[model samples]
Target chain A: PIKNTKVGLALSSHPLASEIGQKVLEEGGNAIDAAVAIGFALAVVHPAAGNIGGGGFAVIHLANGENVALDFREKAPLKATKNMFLDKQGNVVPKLSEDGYLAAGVPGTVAGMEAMLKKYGTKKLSQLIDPAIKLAENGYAISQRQAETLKEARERFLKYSSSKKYFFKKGHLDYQEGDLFVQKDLAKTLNQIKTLGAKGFYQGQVAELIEKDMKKNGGIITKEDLASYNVKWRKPVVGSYRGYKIISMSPPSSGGTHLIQILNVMENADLSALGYGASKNIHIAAEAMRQAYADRSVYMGDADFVSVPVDKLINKAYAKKIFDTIQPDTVTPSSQIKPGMG
Target chain B: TTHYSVADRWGNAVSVTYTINASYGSAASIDGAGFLLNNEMDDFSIKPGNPNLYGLVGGDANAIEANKRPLSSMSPTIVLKNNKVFLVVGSPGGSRIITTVLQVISNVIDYNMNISEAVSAPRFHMQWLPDELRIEKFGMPADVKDNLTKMGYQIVTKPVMGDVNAIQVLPKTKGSVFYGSTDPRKEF
Candidate 1:
């Protein structure tokens, strides 16, 4: 598992982001610093989900043996409503929550990065962000997957003038795999965040531009929402599997709880003995997943808004209850399985 | 939808997972900002029991509320052995994220595979509502599928499930060395 290199490692969806993060680590930046650099670098190169307009979670393990979780998940716009995506006939409106400005949430990536840097990083935002700005300004060669994705979304991109101009070539042709994909506007945005810190994104010119774009469309996110965006510093959800400790992001994300719950259920069985790809093992794992996910649909949500029984959900005993329901050689029909903690 | 993991030489590690909800989220870029906005609204249960783009269904627990964060499946995780960083791992998938991560960890711990094998191994997922098991198009044995289907499990073949990027640390006599692994499901 080790000994290839003593140098730090950074693995990302894009080699560019991984390279940038590795550079930061080589320059004596800590893991949080390298992560911040990688985050911004992905915004420049990996547009699929690498974004400043989106948000995410971070699970951190400090060298001093401390662990923490940062919740930077995007929040609903202040004007958001329960029926926003429903139509007059009580049916769900197709594409209303998936396509345009109205689909957007108030972004928290800027604030999220700022919080990470302030809390644990030894480097400044301007320092960590320069690589991303350079990548965006000068452009990098698009990958085959990037080109294919852009080509597929051409129709959707053409729906928005800004998107069409930025994502396409001069003749509305697709950018080929090694074509230079420059993002001047994105570079400028990164530069502003570099110079003005989080304020550059949440309060001033960039926020104004986003609000203006939203207003012109049918979107509802306001400049105030942008300014008000904040990151939550929550305790990392910790679970024990065999001897290793599993530390992961908390609620707003159902991932950690369910991951642990399923693992707990599987812990009661000898998976290695069951054989990795055997039908019996797969059946047990699938049954465990089904139970955890069923609990997720009913009990998991933003802790600030709902009373999610996180402790009850991940409890080893509770997982045992769910695992006990699994029939070793057969499938458990999902309809037959009910949510736990009754 | 994309994820990355980082580990510094100082023994600290960080696992980060961020997303715009879907590819090219919202499909609308800002006029001057040049970045696309996130379509995370669909992550909420706009209508309870209705599936999101990921086909993940939710109830009032994840219902839409003003300024409340929607439920997400981003599982940025770190594993510690004897209070030392063992692994920093995460993946990018919508509803399949948790299971993807589960298999990776188990692949290493129980199955005794290296990081590369753990990430490259075939995977399957089962969400509660769909009542179907989704396995990758490749790497799965035909017999496993037939056997599961015979046991009353509906099996579906999917192109891919996750793109996991992970870093595993091994303690040496002097210090720890980092071993990084990236999933082959996606292009670099």
Candidate 2:
């Protein structure tokens, strides 16, 4: 329902955040500038999905045709024992993976954003952050989505005194679409970053807060972990489909490489000529996906830790060989597909 | 031999996908933060043909080795003609990503729909597995359904199609820009 003309951008999680980005564009900032502002706003308003406290990959293609993936994904603490989550019997427990301070990795969101702005953005950090600062200082209406997410996580928020004060009010977890949702603490956090850049989060008060909180809460994160974190710039995995070329997140992120593998498998077939959404097409695509995902499970990992076949997997000859196994007009059971080379 | 998928806004584009393993992603997360740490380490099907929850099946070509990134569904892309930008886009819907993006691009290039129309149009995805076709309830025509059904597609209709965010240059104005119409089915 939100509409815009001159400058445009879209984010997956929040309308308000998208609007903020659009407004920045409308105010004459370039796309990267607007994105930086929007990204910061999302940190506060869309905490469930993204935040300064968490880390994610940002795939950026600047206006000048430069493409880069800012890999600010959280890093395990230096003190992290390989089997920290392993039980006394050395079994991996899913619950252990999800709960507590030890589960937290060093946060990279703040530093990552700062680095992007410094490297690619035209506008100064202070100028780009005005809108978010205004939102924080003056406060803005909470949308239904934010309210709902808050309600769902109310118990967890309530459990932490700081979270409760920051996120909730008067024992009630509900808020209307227009109600003000303010986080002064988050605002202060932003200010520190504005002044200190990545150092604000990695080396100063923010790091101190995180360390204190983690230690009190039984986390493995240390000051050294916070100070040592760095974002990596790596080559994007590339592929070609039909006459068009494709690039995606490489190695560390499974999304790009596996997607290409599926595309490669489907290309060997005549599905486009067969028509999209045809049962045969769907079956083939799904089977290819299943196979690709299976491959991802066993083979994909941190490039520093695991060896992956960057070439053979995407090679046309290899893709054709995989394609040869498919039978037209029929489903290929999981057992029938051959695994890729070692 | 090569594959790419792209999404863009004005002249800005981002095409990327990275993974660890399916759901077991190094099996890590911060307790209170609700962050999902990627188990990218497991993305390599060290053992080929072993199906993980993510539905990944691997080949020896993708076998486990040291420091190599695994094959993934992330497609980085671009759309150009004579060095002119037309559109750029990509998504994170697992297998549904390619179809989602293809439909958007086709809607613009083949059907000549406007950016919003192309993006808002209902979509269908076929990954060539399980023999099931996913049709979004929105924007799907009855005749198309009938045609697909007649073609032996097992249709599974859902309210939402794949999530696709895109941007295109306005050809005539040459100064205009178009962003994605946020999918109503999602939180955005």
Candidate 3:
């Protein structure tokens, strides 16, 4: 483990992946470098959380005082109709959201990382990609987690011919804690990009494969959709608790805005001074969370599609009005809480 | 159930809750990487009033849309005091995320327990599913449970509770500490 005396980085949910990032840092790479490396490694090791085939939102606070929110979230394919998954009775078909190629949105992970690195990283794409390439080629032992996951998905893997060839073996999903799991296809794909850059993936063979895969699987992804995808940089949502300023991802992701709203509402209460677990504090925070969640369930959506008054929601003055309704010692049902804009 | 946590010297904290959404995310895996893609979207109940497999509530906002990400109970939080950072915390229980975070923050803000003790204390969670309250055996004192039960709340004892990771800033030293505690009920 490379220990940083001055800077510290921690990633939860994956140990081996975390170690790789830490190693990069120990080698004198900055947080951006480590983050890029970790991002790729996580794609390979923790494919379920999301990987190159999926998309995500990233909030990075640079040591140089710049904070940015990268919106690499997956986009609906151009051919995606409003009722693509709706059946004759208008009831939604479940499989469209879970299994099959239709469930896949055009992937933004690879391009997103490339855009971020090209703009801000000191390391080249080749340098950042080396770690994942090595892992995929030299192969790494499957963890118990991977084995268990394989056993569970054996049937699903068998459903698709491509999936069967790539994921299953001996009429079952392979499982061994220390077995070498290599991704020669994925490795070759990554290598092509490394040599020819983003164009190779977005405009070339990789794009063709993805399109063919989607078509074969009844998905609507098109080469144009893949080429048209672009990462966005939006303002970060900011909040404060006690004295600290909290920066989070904004909508498209309800997480940052909703989290800020919860904190802001809590700030209206004297819970901090009241002590933490006092029934009063717990009751107030819980009530606030319920109310915030209610609002989230009602109003929050993609900011581009809906206008969310995130600023008004977290305004201190607005918070004061909501705080006035708190019944100090009792758990108040959500219906009892009034709703109004600041 | 014993819990332990430490903050990194630089002030980043984490909380985790590793749960099986009905014995391992709907028992599904993707091809190629042998990665088990979560049926988390299934956490969105298929049947109305069925109390989603994980007790997640569904509403108009959470309705499935083409390319819309599913609502999640994975609440990863970073709390700040002043313009400086104070805490970084999050939890991983399917529906228990809110309750776990509320208690941990309460322990620090109200009980004035040090970061470690605050997180390690017994905790209670109540989501409006089946109108029942779920509590860890050691989460709260017996009296609290008795009192809540006496208030007509249906209480159920569960073997698993949320795992919390946190880091609280020590302003006096201008340094931070990090702590990670997995729920004792599971192997982390």
Candidate 4:
């Protein structure tokens, strides 16, 4: 992990992703520029999560000392409704919300990557994106891990015509280690984004194809939903832990608020004295997380839609309030813990 | 999904945590676009108290609503010390995202480990529901695991956990040096 780098450092799930980001930095692109490339490269290489179809959050720390949180998390389609996953009997419909075209939300990654490139990046979308496009076109050898994940999802992939067509070899053969996994369609998709930027994904051919697929699958995401999708720039959730400042993603993402809340509770403990990984320390950690997650369940969500008490949840006082309930060397069953605010 | 951390010589850093919600997303590829669509709608609380793909439940705050972004655990974080970047870290683990980032920070600052040791160390998570302490298989010291079980905790051992890729910045008189670490649980 200690590869000394005075130039720059980039760490990603895939070797190609990390390599592409470093290439951007070496070419004089800033951190955000490297991120732009890595984000797309992942879509091609690490399909598990690195995605253009999905969404995510980013926390950027500028050399000028400003911190920013970009929330590009996906949005429910305009036609989505509450309880859409419920069965006629009012029970949760198993897999209804998780397994197919109807489960998709309006994508936001293309918009997000473009915004970052335009706002903070020193490179153009076309420049940073070529690596991903090249990677997709030329293909890479599937790693053992990638092969396993693809195998595990074999049955699931077989269920969908398009999935089966793209994910497996002709005749539906499994991709094994060192197998060259190519996606010509993905390369064309990246090429569109390179030429038209966000519009490439949200409008025109990509949008039309997405809408057509949705209609064919009885799904709700339409061309309008794709065109209207936008990314939000929110203030980073700021807090301090023993003097070190913690800045993380804001709501729509529960990570920052609850993370700071847990830290607040832990700050009250003498974890160093108790020792790391000791049962006593683990007990406190578990208790702190228990309280914070309870609050997350009840109060955390997309700030654009709901009033998440940003000031209150990450407050030191809130942590202290929950910390007071922790008993030394004991466990707090989650069932007994309610949202601290209520 | 995946996370990557980047830091440039200019002292700028970006921590990104993006996902398709699950492996291969919704498993339905756009026929012509050649990419899979995300099942992110599943991230919403389809019904209050019912778990999503990650077994993380929600309330009315995160219920499905038209045009509203669903709640997510995709935490990308940056830590600053004295107004300078200190750490850039994030991971992809559904609900385990928060705890994974927190532990790495704590490992560096509190446990005094370097970036490599910090991220390579065994990690655990308690996500409020399930009420179980999910630890990496054989990750906890035998004594610690025994003590937790004795303390009325339900310990679930998973084969693997998080894939956190992180960078630690060390500012020097000449120029800042970057120490980067990729989680060992998964291959590069």
What C-alpha lDDT do the candidate models reach, one value each? Answer: 0.89, 0.56, 0.56, 0.87
Candidate topping DockQ: 4
Off by over 4 Å in 3: A1-4, A196-201, A272-278, A328-330, A334-342, B1-138, B149-188
lDDT of 3 by residue, A1-342 (tens): 112234444443456666775665566565456556666665565544435665555555443445566666566667755455567876767655556565555566677777767765667778777887788777777777667766666665556666565555546557578787776666777787678777656778777777766676676778998888877877767776655576665765555665666667777766656564455555555556656655554555556654667787667766666566666445555445434432
Model 4, range B1-188, lDDT digits (tens) per residue? Answer: 78889988988889998888888898888887778888898888888788887788888899888899999887789988888888899888888889998999888877878889989988989988889999987688888888888878899987677898999988788888889888889722
Ranking, DockQ, top scorer first: 4, 1, 2, 3
Stretches off by above 4 angstroms in model 2 are: A1-12, A155-159, A269-274, B1-10, B14-84, B90-163, B173-179
Provide per-model DockQ scores: 0.79, 0.20, 0.19, 0.80
Clashing pairs in 4: A49-B1
**Model 4 spans > 4 angstroms off:** none
Off by over 4 Å in 1: A1-4
What tens digits encode model 2's per-residue C-alpha lDDT throughout A43-157?
6665554466655555666677665676765665676544455567756555344434554556666666777678766678876666666667677778776666566655544
Give the least accurate 10-residue stretch of model 3 chain A, judged by summed lDDT. Answer: A1-10
lDDT of 4: 0.87
Interface RMSD of 3: 6.1
TM-score of each: 0.98, 0.78, 0.78, 0.98
Evaluation by DockQ, superior candidate among 2 and 3: 2
TM-score of chain A of each: 0.97, 0.90, 0.91, 0.98
Predicted candidate 1 versus true structure: per-residue lDDT over A1-342, tens digit per residue: 322355688888888988898888788898899999999999999997899999999999998988999999999999999899999987999999999999988998889999999999999999999999999999999898998888887888888888888888897778899999999999989999999999999888998998888999889988889988989999988899999999998898999999998999999888889667878888888999988888888998999999988898889999898788787567778898778747
